[PDB]
Symmetry: D2
Amino acid sequence: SAVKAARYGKDNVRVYKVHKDEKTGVQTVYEMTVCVLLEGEIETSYTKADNSVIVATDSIKNTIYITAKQNPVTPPELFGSILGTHFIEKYNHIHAAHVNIVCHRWTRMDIDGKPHPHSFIRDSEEKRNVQVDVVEGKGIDIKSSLSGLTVLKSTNSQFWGFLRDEYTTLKETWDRILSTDVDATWQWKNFSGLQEVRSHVPKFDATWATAREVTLKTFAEDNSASVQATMYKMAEQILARQQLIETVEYSLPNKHYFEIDLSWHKGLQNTGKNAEVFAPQSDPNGLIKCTVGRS
Amino acid sequence: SAVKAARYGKDNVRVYKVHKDEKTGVQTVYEMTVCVLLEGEIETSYTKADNSVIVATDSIKNTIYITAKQNPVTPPELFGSILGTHFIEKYNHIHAAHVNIVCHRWTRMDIDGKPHPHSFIRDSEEKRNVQVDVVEGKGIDIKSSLSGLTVLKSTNSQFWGFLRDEYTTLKETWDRILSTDVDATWQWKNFSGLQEVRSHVPKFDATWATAREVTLKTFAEDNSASVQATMYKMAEQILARQQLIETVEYSLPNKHYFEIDLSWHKGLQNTGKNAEVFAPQSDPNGLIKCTVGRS
Amino acid sequence: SAVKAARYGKDNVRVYKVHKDEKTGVQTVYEMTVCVLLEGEIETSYTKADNSVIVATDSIKNTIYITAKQNPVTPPELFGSILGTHFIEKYNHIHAAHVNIVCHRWTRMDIDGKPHPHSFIRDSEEKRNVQVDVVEGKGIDIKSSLSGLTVLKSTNSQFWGFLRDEYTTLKETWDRILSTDVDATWQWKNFSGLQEVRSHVPKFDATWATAREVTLKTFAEDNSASVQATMYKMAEQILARQQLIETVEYSLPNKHYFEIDLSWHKGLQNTGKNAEVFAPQSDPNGLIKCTVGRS
Amino acid sequence: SAVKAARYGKDNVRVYKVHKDEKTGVQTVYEMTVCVLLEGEIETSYTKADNSVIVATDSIKNTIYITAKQNPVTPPELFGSILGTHFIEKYNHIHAAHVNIVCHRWTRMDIDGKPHPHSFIRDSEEKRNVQVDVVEGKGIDIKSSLSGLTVLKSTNSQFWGFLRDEYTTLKETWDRILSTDVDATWQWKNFSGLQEVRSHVPKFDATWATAREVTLKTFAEDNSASVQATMYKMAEQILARQQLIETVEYSLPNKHYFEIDLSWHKGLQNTGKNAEVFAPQSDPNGLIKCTVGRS
Ligand SMILES: O=c1[nH]c(=O)c2nn[nH]c2[nH]1
Ligand SMILES: O=c1[nH]c(=O)c2nn[nH]c2[nH]1
Ligand SMILES: O=c1[nH]c(=O)c2nn[nH]c2[nH]1
Ligand SMILES: O=c1[nH]c(=O)c2nn[nH]c2[nH]1
Ligand code: NA
Ligand code: NA
Ligand code: NA
Ligand code: NA
Ligand SMILES: [Xe]
Ligand SMILES: [Xe]
Ligand SMILES: [Xe]
Ligand SMILES: [Xe]
């Protein structure tokens, strides 16, 4: 037997950082969960009980806090690239670092119509994420994403003209509820190293904001022919607005809301045009994915 | 042996309702999870296998959908009272109904600075809840609550002057992070029946909004001496603003964020005035409760 | 306004303890999650910012570890009573302690048909719990429970003869699946203090084992007329076997498994006597409760 | 823009099946959660709103129930292969099916030392899983796994001799607690189609049982030099016992239990040889992975 692949590190490292402006008194907080996994010439820790090649996962944890102390933690694409680069530069025998960051929302409170200097609210479990792979001699690959963005529209969604055979019971519809949890990932062109990542810093927050805005607007305005058709429109627009993105991937559950026939009860009408009360279904759910790239 | 207490019913009934304004084209959605438990002269179903006294839980489920079809579902205090009253009026041998409703957020989307007519976002897992107990001959008791409101302030929280003995290691502090998930419940004076509940309908949404606003403002503005002292200030203000509330209860976790001493690493300073990077603690947590009533 | 009720303390304190037998080499592990909430003359911490009355929740955490170091942690009824008694004896102004303990399963592994001396498996998320209320001058009240015991029987459950009216669609049945998650609580007679709790130590583990055995056997053997009738049989037997229990409470979800009509597809028969494939329903669920005491 | 990859289908389809032996009266139950995603010539549903190419996800759901009705559901490797093959044979334009199955435990109850004919218990949230990829013209690729197997040993784990630098605070140890949740996957050699999968049916359950047994025994008996070294020993043995497996992958969290220094309290000794009470840490955790194949 032989080791074909190996990676190890620290998962679920929660980190908070505060920035304090001395001039204005305004404070800004960041909270993330970080995972770092390393690869390199570490096979002997598995095969020969040779721990000399192991950077202890506890040390990886320490390094995350130290790096957060000495560097900006925003945008997360930059922080992840700094953190990953550290490991390949510091340890001769480590040749790849894989950094995943989940950013949690702390939105500044408005009190009496004014932004509060040091108080924050968690408005939604929506996350902004990055995956950064730093591979020695191959640069820095960054995938940015948003997840946990949950939306619903109550009309202007249709689904008809699908394949009908002996397995089909679904009725065609010209008016249905459409609800999903959006997971959208945009993959950046490969960067040569940290200097190049630094050179593009302003694009990271702007592209996240664009991806979010395009997602929300397209969802709200499309008279949707299917989840497939609407998601494609989203991806197309993101690629058109940021040339440094190579691909956009969406993964969307179709969270079903079923009509409830109440006609058995005093002829009550609650289907088709008369549908007012619906039963949200926890499971099963449709799952629709697509990756869109350039011609 | 004897049956000392018994209740039964249907839990986790998910319900969605849409309202469509024909004039303006605007749609509004409501989504709730409902639980209904009944009590009454049902002991024989337990002791003698006499199912004749059982309103099937499946029928309770049907009744929830039918009631939602025929009545407004907002404010939830009214819907819960209608639903509970139904059971005690319809079934001679049922003498109490206990209705719990959790309302999920579907907030209308703003697209290009304008409210969208039929598209919604789940902004946070904050819930608005009601517990309604309808007891034959004793009226209607309603407890209203908000839960899952998660906040953090990065300064203007202190904790010093507590009891110190041989079990104490905690250092006094004049500047700490304070973060909590707010669970706040206000208990209404007993109502004589549905007519009286209807007469107070406008107060329900207004009091919820007040409770939320007081919670947020007090949290943001109090230079907090402890969770205990700040929560009391919140409860006092709510009672002062709505005379029909008898008690206010708060239950607040104290979600700790620990300083990280980094001085072992090149004398890096990250404690006290120099603290920038902290470690959020998932557990354990303080838990502080109080019920405030009138003199 | 006035403080009507107040309690505070530490929740979610995870504790592990190991016992090492020097003679046999055998090790035994215990793992629990503990919550302690205190009451007493603490109103001024809320109303006047007087922290002098506060035993810090951090100190409560320390006390839990110290008490676990110096005392047996099994049975949990004894440990909870020791822990609660500590607070009312140590602090003059604290008059009640409320201790909740959840015990996690670590079952010794069998390797090659022999018990291993120091290796354990988590066989199920079933928990054994205690709630201990120690109130100065009123003794010690203990509620013991098991929870998270999930069972299913594929036949020998019936449900017919229930009330039928205009809200009823449920068909009577003489053969259905019955599945539930068992939550069973037995409440001990009040104990005068720690000496009396110590005197009954052997009864705690034995009664837990009896409650579990009666639950499982009755579920498996009863040709069940309803959840109500079967649960009553369980409670009756527990009360008959332990005279020091005053009441038994069961709370049981009815986790539904629905027949799937496949007759639309090539006349395939999958209902009634021909039912083989079913759809488990995540929600809604029946919820049936009962508290049984002595005549 | 162009569609680079696309797949869609139904997730979270819960299925239960019962087998009834008419001769013995014994019943056996199976419960699974199934996901099926399809690929093929479906780009136009995304780009042109052409639903004619879409097998509706609702129809995929129906197909899962129909297939479960007409075929054995055990071993899951066989059921997944039947289900996946169906889609590529039935629909000309579908060229790959991806089937994931999670099998839930329903273990027959022992009542009075005898196996009960129709009553079952969920002993642990451990799962047995399969991933089956059926690709037209490329055969059937099957990955089998176990997950959610949670174990702990209280001694006979060491960790010393790791890299020490200016980022390191971790002390070397010759005696620690080791606890993990095991995720183990074995990848079968590619099968040419369903006939070949059928020919190997007996190997599936036997290999699962072997993988489980090797995991448990090695964990219990290894005087572990690290998670890395112990997991390698596990993987090596599995590959030696089943020649039709190409690779074994383990992914193991290192769930930390920290010593608690109590010496500040009356010189109480609870570290090193005197350690009895520990604090389980919910996060962060080490994460160690390895894929082992043949020379
Ligand atoms: O078994 C271990 N492997 C590791 O890589 C490690 N790092 N810290 N502690 C550890 N324990
Ligand atoms: O056992 C049951 N008890 C009930 O009260 C009930 N209601 N519907 N189905 C049921 N099954
Ligand atoms: O606000 C607080 N209240 C308390 O009771 C406490 N105990 N430790 N820290 C604390 N902070
Ligand atoms: O938008 C949809 N896409 C689909 O593929 C599908 N299948 N059933 N319903 C559906 N809705
Ligand atoms: Na390197
Ligand atoms: Na009545
Ligand atoms: Na006292
Ligand atoms: Na095909
Ligand atoms: Xe951070
Ligand atoms: Xe609703
Ligand atoms: Xe413990
Ligand atoms: Xe199944």
